[PDB]
Subunit: 307 residues, 6 copies
């Protein structure tokens, strides 16, 4: 008995996933009270059922997170059988350690504990910022890579001896994976010091493909593109998974040298970003639908990592 429920964060993606599964979204009234508190009511029998909740913890981050945990609590007191939380974009994931024992929280661990507390049985995400966040839960966590869609889109560009560049030091593993998949090309890395940006590798007269896991303000992306072009690269393409686009992202992308920015749909786009002419969107609904189908049927999930 598979039922899908959606919050207010990604309703359109939840509709696409439901369409690809040939079912319909379950009836739940998820809204706000007068003072801003989350209101949830489940409007159908869920006893013994296998429930999936689809909601990214994107901006407004805290309201979306509260919607998620409150729906899980309402479902779990209504005697639901098993609850899987599909969270295409896992928010607060960049706060995953205390560097130099600074007096900061590990907020990803706090969110994982909240989800375990209200009674989630399984989590399914796309492109976690740190893969060790799989260990912040006591439940199985399936971290699905978004690279098949992006790679299928890259191979339709007919680049002239492309080189894969990671905009920073934290993206090197993902850049290397993409470089191996993209006919096993070269790789270069942007290193930032003091300000001045150094490039480790040769980018002279080649098409450069920047790959990252998110675009928040476009700062690192735009700066790396400027560095690549001023060391003589023909074209630069940016390829990310999570389109956060916060702050001054629209102006940063508009006044940039990036020829094309391609993102997935784990977060809905705003109006100013949709108005931009060089920002294009791929869809992850098929991949998420197949993962949900495999989880619901006691099937192996390893087939989801094939290209």
């Amino acid at each position: 008995d598979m039922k899908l429920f959606a919050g207010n964060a990604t309703p359109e993606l939840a509709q696409r996933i439901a369409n690809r599964l040939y079912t319909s979204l379950g009836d739940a009234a998820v809204g706000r009270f007068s003072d801003g508190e989350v209101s949830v009511q489940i409007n159908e029998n869920v006893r013994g059922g296998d429930i999936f909740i689809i909601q990214s913890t994107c901006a407004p981050t805290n309201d979306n997170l509260m919607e998620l945990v409150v729906m899980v609590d309402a479902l779990r007191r209504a005697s639901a059988g098993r609850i899987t939380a599909v969270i295409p974009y896992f928010g607060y994931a960049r706060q995953d350690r205390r560097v130099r024992s600074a007096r900061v929280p590990i907020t990803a661990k706090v969110v994982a504990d909240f989800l375990s507390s209200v009674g989630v049985d399984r989590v399914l995400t796309v492109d976690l910022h740190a893969e060790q966040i799989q260990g912040f839960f006591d439940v199985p966590v399936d971290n699905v890579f978004g690279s098949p869609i992006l790679l299928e889109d890259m191979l339709q560009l007919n680049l002239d001896n492309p080189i894969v560049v990671s905009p920073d030091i934290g993206g090197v593993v993902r850049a290397r994976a993409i470089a191996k998949l993209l006919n096993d090309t070269d790789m270069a890395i942007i290193d930032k010091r003091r300000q001045v940006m150094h490039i480790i590798g040769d980018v002279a007269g080649r098409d450069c493909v920047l790959v990252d896991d998110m675009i928040d303000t476009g700062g690192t992306l735009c700066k790396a593109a400027e560095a690549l072009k001023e060391r003589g690269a023909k074209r630069v393409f940016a390829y990310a998974t999570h389109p956060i686009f916060s702050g001054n992202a629209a102006n940063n992308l508009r006044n940039s040298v990036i020829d094309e920015v391609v993102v997935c749909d784990t977060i809905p786009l705003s109006d100013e970003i949709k108005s931009l002419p060089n920002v294009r969107t791929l869809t992850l609904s098929g991949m998420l639908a197949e993962a949900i189908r495999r989880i619901s049927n006691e099937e192996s999930i390893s087939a989801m990592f094939e290209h």
Copy 2:
């Protein structure tokens, strides 16, 4: 080693409490990242100390709640000794049961579990909506009544044989307590059916004192005042503790028959409400300061319930 920390919800109240304790607020940078996520950094040694955090979970409710739990987590990983959360207004407290086994959450229990999960050792609140929320925690919870301040203000009005009215059926216990304290006067109750409001009791030619625990939209308050005046009451005064004032509260209070509305300061007032000429504010900083002082010194807290 008593240290006080404040969030962004009630900073001015935290300053008044610190002033009455002749100390200063501890240094912590509590803010937002670019995308709306809570940022916390403790900027001083808290090892082994006795920490108090002062923050109401008022609107914006979810951001304030996340600030609170994230500060508790950061303090607890920095090896703080004991953490007391002073929460003058406990949000989400109106969702405390499932009526008729409706498929709703018990969100107050969820919030209590989150606070117990991040490592709170003690909670101190003012005028909980339901006193049974004391049982939603495994830690001691001190629910301090705000009625001493309000009563001290009522006794300075020189009312002509006043009668204490509860605007609804849920406020009868608080109304009875106030009526006993206010020279042991009469009590009347507003009952709403179908629309039409019935008054149980005699209110003809008497000064009426409405008492409640919050004013959210002013709906029940304004309607009860209209009923009281159209059954012939001389003057009506409204006395509440938590000034939520959400939605159309300013217009409802402006176009009403209530002569004076008196509230406490557990939630900061907006500009439109401060502009109103018949809304007046009392302060709870002395009572909270004395409660914090008694908790810090291993002293009996029962003296806080004296009039």
Copy 3:
């Protein structure tokens, strides 16, 4: 695989519930050792089954509570699948908070923690003293109102413009619900001060119906009846759900002015009470049987709250 087990508290009610479900009580030897310790032995295979235990925590309260938790432990180590505890009368429910931070326990929370500790999966009660006790558990709790049976009995009295009276301030919500159900009549409330009892409302020349959730000693009930009659009420009927009848209840009811006392059967009656001529009993076996049937079949429980 539905199996019913019964303790020693309410065996006759368990038999009626079994009869209405067309099954038989499971074989378990629940008794006492020589020194008063609870002895439990399950005498049949319960592996993977869906178990229901029917036992009120009525007097002797502590022996009944220990029987319940010990049966749950024996069933859970015998590899039972799911255990539902049907507790028609939830004892210790009047101790649900600490008033004025008095150094008392919250014993309802202690009992809820014990039940969660031995491994109960679901609780089903009738007319909880405080509905917030639903939040003292981490499991679903279904609090079924006994008002349908009592209302069906009230409507067969043909009262002359009846008025519904709550004997104290804590029963106002239940009295209001009954008043709405009983053709939407008036409501009056007994208020006790200092001794002297005040009645808020008009009771002159009307049939009065006192409604409460329990009758423990009959003190409040008898006193309220005396007040109602000495302000001129024609007849007084008392309507309760839980017949505790402790202490001097028999003498208090015998030497009273109440014309008829009607109770449910969540607690068995003693001999002295059955000898009384004006105490009558209704049965809840049909309602509990239907609730058990709906829980066992993954059906919606909301239909149980219909009149």
Copy 4:
């Protein structure tokens, strides 16, 4: 800050322990409500203090156990620092396993879980039935042997080449320890089959000393004494620690051949037993007082096991 509190089970022993510590019992009102429910109120400040509760879980077993857990809960919500439960006789300790996977509970584990749930920090008992019950807790458990007092009393009898006999197979380890302490004498064991009792060892013309951990009904004790005398033993003395004396114990001991029965005071004696001329009582107040003193002062507890 050492404070002692006592329940209703062993108040006189608690007074003796307080006298030997030159302090007084703390003020707490522990009683019953009208219907038999436990009532507890702490009447003094216990914040930060080191609390000891002295109460055996003797008959009436369940009321005493509930008093204990309810006092612990009331103390723990009043912000007590550390709570030690001194339980001279640990009830329900004979139910410590499931023999042949019988569908019975392990009730000692249930009691240990309840004590850990309400927040006990340390347990101190005398002569546990099974020493592995130390492993049923997550807190330190100090199981103090009562054999020093009993041995000091045995050595004042001037027996003629005594032999130490265990009445059953479960008491062999304790009998061997006593035999080693009692000038390293011989040991014999009673074995019961089918009825007929076999004695392994030689008891002809010797003074026999039966040692056990409890006397519940006197069945095994009286039967073993009869067997010993009908295989020709001069005198038989019975030496136990816990005087349960339930059921027909008074008649069994009166119509027996045991010359003298000596017990400790972990359970108060009834009137019929005190009337018996050959039942004598030793006291454990000094040993328990010294153990409490050593626990309170961060001193080594190993000195308590010296003879």
Copy 5:
């Protein structure tokens, strides 16, 4: 969906159990990394299945224990349904209490907590050293006696009025059970003091059968055999369940007077022990296979304790 997995401790026994169940061992690669750390990989779909893991915690004890807990963790994150751990020999079981409050651990409780932590749902062992270790878990534990096989082997010896002897005081209960089963014969006990060994009972001119639960170094066994022969016993046979055989066991058994040593196969034998001519092995694969079959089918396990 019953699947069997085996570790490296008892692979041959796991094969025999699989053969008697007419299935095959599941595919899992359990090995060591270069530095000695346990490596585990499950090579098949286990989603929703009912898993059994067969592995004794025998020498090397800590590597076997780590293999077990690591396999349980890998299975539980792969979404296995229910995990039963068949542990024919439970290691660390001799450390089950703190005698005289010595500063030692209770290591059996630590192992039980680890197994409960990684997510074991049920434990099945053979001949636990202390039966109270059943209470160290929160899950059902089935402690199956190995005495049927040993008794079936004893009855094929045609002994001349045999007597059953326990080599020490801790084995008396097991010796008594065997003596009752073996046509209800006599029993004698070895008592060790100061060195000198005393025998309680008559062993002159009888065949002696020593029964124990393990043979670790053969010290107690060889010494008891010497004592029995030097008080004139015709033949001595040793009967144990767990063949640990550590240290100098081979030399102790070779230079001994025991005519025949019979053991079960809960631990594999070494080469030096297999070379011995008077050490013989029985098999427990049929009994364990039937217990696994009964657990998998929701059948009563009590039939396993029949002779």
Copy 6:
């Protein structure tokens, strides 16, 4: 009351740390029983004390881990106050996620759960393989970098325009940190594909400094050195923190082109490795002693990250 205890893994390091703190190691007998099981006995009063246990989880990994958890359990049942585990080398840390949802365990999370289960209050490690393992605990974890000692040793080599190389893609962050500290030099990275090793960066005619966190078999290190020399580098130095040196490490290092290998002392060296002429050891005893001193005195730990 600071007490230090040591296991058998790193006794000599524990002695150096004790010497720098001007105290002595506490008395505890930590050994093995006959069959290989861990034996622990604490031989002094530890009640209320602040305990530190110094032991790396190095090879033999599982015995060392069991020693650690068993000592923690023995200390915690002896009523120790606070227990800090100093684990200079955290074993099993390389298994920190499930790549592509492979059916493997996350063994670092299992070890963290075991340590939290037995009652550790704080962990202090050196150079964790993944810094997110800080989030696998609920207690504070201080991950101290070993780079100050290594950098102080590098600056005493007088290299000719050195370049810092990371032998693999996982070491890039550490290599970048060292490069910034080492007068802000260049950085190059070894990339391995299919076999063939690519170097991103220019290493022609420069002194190369390989930095890693461990040396297990020397495979990556020796291969990277060969690649660097066959692209023309003058000298190659290897700088690591944890000297695991397992398998064929001695032969790999002997038949290599690395001029000098410098390691810390978090793991003791074997004889074959000490015989090597180009392997040199630094000490971390001063840094660990200062960290222990700061933890014991409620001082800020951030001063430990200064160069």
